[PDB]
Design a protein around this ligand. Structure first.
Ligand SMILES: c1cnc2c(c1)ccc1cccnc12
Ligand SMILES: c1cnc2c(c1)ccc1cccnc12
Ligand SMILES: c1cnc2c(c1)ccc1cccnc12
Ligand SMILES: c1cnc2c(c1)ccc1cccnc12
Ligand SMILES: c1cnc2c(c1)ccc1cccnc12
Ligand SMILES: c1cnc2c(c1)ccc1cccnc12
Ligand SMILES: [Ca+2]
Ligand SMILES: [Ca+2]
Length: 316
């Protein structure tokens, strides 16, 4: 909507106070004009018709419990936009400042969040398995990263390309969590998964097997469930990225860590310059090694650590 840029305040899903970029025109809208072609957040009103109505408050104050998911979808979309722009010189998900649109309160008790091809969509969770899924900065960045993938490599959401698609979302979700720097970790979804059980999460990148996900190619799921295990086999690639960043010994293979920034630079380069819709795990190995060479040289530690990490998870 046309109006003047303002700054509201409200509380997120975890009860934390934050400032939000709004637009005033009779009401104050969750429309952030400070970032590209804007960030817009909508109310789906417990229905599945999208996007619903642009989010408004009469007083620029967003402290109602009903507001909480809208505040976090809006604010964490802005963090994610800041990460891609400041770190990778990428302007929104398409590289041309596309408007970021999010809908919250999607359906009734819906334990999921997704990129629908045009926008982000967040359930409120059933209150037991999940609380409103926009409460997790890694969840928000994971979903927006599907948009980045779809506009770049275009990795098909099935089998090994789909498992890489998921792993890129987990990797960049985790690097955005670290960029915001609010008690970051290598787990996925800890802020919104099983509210009343301490220190569990959807997935672990440091120890995928902690939640039954494979951490070696030999252990990969080959059946048809989960589009050929896109959320399962992601563990193999998540473990490789963890090892590249943080180092370790895994099935007796030792990896010297090169840190999060170089992990991000290498996988960002692989995603945007080398991966294709049909890339399999071995092709990801090749893309990452080349990305590391491009950036650091063919005899660099950085290239050595990428090779070590893929060897450790049995990906040649
Ligand atoms: C209308 C109102 N405010 C804005 C725009 C359009 C566009 C960009 C922008 C950047 C920073 C702050 N305000 C605006
Ligand atoms: C700090 C804390 N609570 C408030 C304000 C500022 C301003 C207005 C208001 C209106 C109703 C309830 N609480 C507040
Ligand atoms: C800081 C600032 N404003 C507020 C709060 C805290 C808490 C509640 C509230 C309710 C209505 C209006 N403003 C506030
Ligand atoms: C589209 C829309 N809503 C849903 C689904 C898909 C799948 C499951 C589900 C469970 C509870 C509430 N809504 C949904
Ligand atoms: C949901 C999803 N995409 C959109 C909107 C709402 C509204 C406007 C618009 C304009 C260009 C591209 N996409 C959208
Ligand atoms: C089946 C077969 N070989 C393996 C595994 C599972 C798991 C790990 C491993 C590590 C080194 C060599 N082989 C294997
Ligand atoms: Ca996390
Ligand atoms: Ca929990």
């Amino acid at each position: 909507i046309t109006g003047t840029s303002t700054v509201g305040v409200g509380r997120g899903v975890l009860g934390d106070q934050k400032n939000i970029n709004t637009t005033y025109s009779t009401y104050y809208y969750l429309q952030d004009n400070t970032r590209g072609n804007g960030i817009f957040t909508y109310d789906a009103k417990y229905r599945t018709t999208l996007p619903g109505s642009l989010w408004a408050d009469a007083d620029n104050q967003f402290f109602a419990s009903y507001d909480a998911p809208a505040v976090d979808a809006h604010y964490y979309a802005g963090v994610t936009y800041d990460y891609y722009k400041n770190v990778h010189n990428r302007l929104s998900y398409d590289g041309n400042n596309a408007a970021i649109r999010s809908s919250v309160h999607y359906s009734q008790g819906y334990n999921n969040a997704f990129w629908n091809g045009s926008q982000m969509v967040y359930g409120d969770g059933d209150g037991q398995t999940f609380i409103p899924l926009s409460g997790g900065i890694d969840v928000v960045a994971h979903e927006l990263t599907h948009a980045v993938t779809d506009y770049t490599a275009g990795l098909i959401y099935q089998n090994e390309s789909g498992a890489i698609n998921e792993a890129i979302s987990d990797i960049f979700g985790t690097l955005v969590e670290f960029y915001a720097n609010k008690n970051p970790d290598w787990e996925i979804g800890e802020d919104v998964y099983t509210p009343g059980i301490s220190g569990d999460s959807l997935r672990s990148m440091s120890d995928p097997a902690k939640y039954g996900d494979p951490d070696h190619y030999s252990k990969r799921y080959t059946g048809t469930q989960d589009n050929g295990g896109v959320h399962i086999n992601s563990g193999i690639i998540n473990k490789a990225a963890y090892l590249i960043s943080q180092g370790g010994t895994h099935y007796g293979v030792s990896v010297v860590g090169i840190g999060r920034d170089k992990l991000g630079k290498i996988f960002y380069r692989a995603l945007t310059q080398y991966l294709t819709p049909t890339s399999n795990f071995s092709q990801l190995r090749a893309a990452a090694v080349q990305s590391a060479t491009d950036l650091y040289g063919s005899t660099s530690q950085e290239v050595a650590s990428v090779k070590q990490a893929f060897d450790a998870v049995g990906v040649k």
